[PDB]
């Protein structure tokens, strides 16, 4: 699969397999893993991550919205897939015909689904209880009650599981998390009172799964830890085993030159050289997700930290090197060169954000190259496929 | 073309056609326009923008790197296409077989292209002179001479044009711009001295074209103004005619609930309600390019500006509304509701960035809907092509 600019993501499928294996070893043997692939598998690519995670013993998959799930099904994947985000009622039949379960938690959604149902297809759903995330899900007892009442008109909807999600499992202090846990217990009690067997319960994300007792239920939902990154800096010290980061981001010196003292670099001349400087250019920019707020950040060239100088542009940025290098010299934005390592977390901290957002926003413009047992096994260039 | 989440980009093809028509009428009638589509046509989608710009009288297209050019060629577009960014020598024969011109400005690129030539292909190229952008291009007299000498060994490489790019055309005060113009003049003189006809010269981006006499040459390269946005706030007062913004971004209320006083919303409970509050949730988040730094930004609901509350998550965010609205209510992130308008510029200013970066980073996840003469003519859902 070809690509024609020397800028690429490298995804180490061994690393993803090892994180999933380690998690599966760490949790009880009767507890399933959803591999959570939403956001183009956190920027690692939907399909290869899904397949490797399954190979490593994840049994189920989860994605943000229905189109993401169809990407998986069109790739030949047959494992269960749950849509975690809210879905409009018009998705009922297409979810059904593609064996995809949806999160459903509103009597109004059920009303509309009854109207839109094509009569040929039953759909599986999970109930989301909002136990303090404030995002989606049922919160109140009366609310749950009317939701169940309306479900009686929809025998084509079939409960497959019930879940909640934690807002603070990545904070050392547990007050809010403990309140969520207690609230969720009350919600499950309501459900049993209304005569509904939850069947299959899941609550824990990466942070909760790696920290807390009695949190596993029937399944956990793993995103960031599968990609080998800590949910936060503050809990890193407390994780039970070493996470192996799966993603790196590289570029090659596309031009190099010596720029006289005082000359300007990039838009609005926000950087001037202070001596005769070696300035390299690389072919990646904010259209690839490498945003302007990274100006001044230090990338790796020949194992040395070297700064991005001048404004980052849509497709290119410049770097001040101490020495001439040849055109083609590898430049690493996330990953390892020699003894040096730039984590997605370090890029995120410089950017004033979190690692999730750094990885997931690496744009579809950038090819992914997949490594397994140390050999390249696949290249995906999403531009090729338009 | 189907999509299964109610979040979308609207691209008004009329606005684009109109901006290009107006630019074409504003510049001299023998001056061509490159339609600049790099970055997924600044978030608007490569192919339909290219097509409508050409229908509108643009005669040529420009992209950042080869793969973007091949998207256009595969869509059956036959107009000239220039790659503006730096390309590896290994690109030589593919760019030839695909009728794509590359930017070429390095002796070493030539030496390498010599090695790599199909012995059959002829490739067209433009010389980039760096007159002060500091990014790529020839800067020196001896450099140019050496470059032209190496070309002697490459009869398969054919000059199509010569260009430079301005770093400061979007600043009121013109000192740096005037120095670039003078440097570029000297550079063209060296080129004439060394026996080369430029053939076809271009220098101006949107801001230069809209401001300056004597700057058109044989063609201008239009990006941001084609999409109907000002290159900066500083020069907006001074543009010769009104720009018509082509892109808006919308979603729907996917959940709505009343949350009691003091309850928390989203990760790390960074927002708690100050009274009993109506909180809506929408299915777009940072994986769509709607980044966490937009927390606190006000979007439009029912013609009213309302705040994003709590952390934006990968696929969803929450909004504090003054009144209950029905599920499915329209939420506009960029665009018009009633008398209210949120420009990409306003989003950028809140974000501490520029409008270019806001539009161009709307993810491949989000479907684009295209409007011509007020009717939908096309939907592109990139996730489908996977
Ligand atoms: Cl949730
Ligand atoms: Cl340039």
Author numbering:
A (entry chain A), B (entry chain B): 4 to 389
What is the paper's account of this structure, in its own sentences?
Here we report the biochemical and structural characterization of B. anthracis (Ames) alanine racemase (AlrBax), an essential enzyme in prokaryotes and a target for antimicrobial drug development. The enzyme utilizes a pyridoxal 5'-phosphate (PLP) cofactor to catalyze the racemization of L-alanine to D-alanine, an essential component of the peptidoglycan layer in bacterial cell walls. The dal1 gene product (AlrBax) is found on the spores' outermost layer and addition of alanine racemase inhibitors has been shown to promote germination of B. anthracis' spores while endogenous production of D-alanine, mediated by alanine racemase, inhibits germination.
Consistent with other alanine racemases, the tertiary structure of AlrBax is a homodimer formed by head-to-tail-association of two monomers. Residues in the N-terminus (16–245) fold into an eight-stranded α/β barrel, while the C-terminal residues (246–389) and the first 15 N-terminal amino acids are part of a predominantly β-structure. The homodimer displays two active sites, formed by residues from the N-terminus of one monomer and residues from the C-terminus of the other monomer. The PLP cofactor forms a covalent bond to Lys41 and points at the center of the α/β barrel. As previously observed for AlrGst, extra density was present in the active of AlrBax, which we model here as a molecule of acetate. The oxygen atoms from the acetate molecule in our model are within hydrogen bonding distance to the side chain oxygen from Tyr289', the main chain nitrogen from Met317' and, perhaps more importantly, to the side chain nitrogen atom from the catalytic Lys41 residue. One striking difference in the active site involves Asn131, which in other alanine racemases is generally a carbamylated lysine that participates in a hydrogen bond with the residue homologous to Arg138. In AlrBax, however, we note a prominent chloride ion that is located near Arg138 in the active site. As AlrBax lacks the conserved lysine residue necessary for carbamylation it has apparently drafted a chloride ion to fill the same role for this species. Our analyses of both structures suggest that despite differences in space group and crystal lattice, reductive methylation does not significantly alter the structure of alanine racemase from B. anthracis.
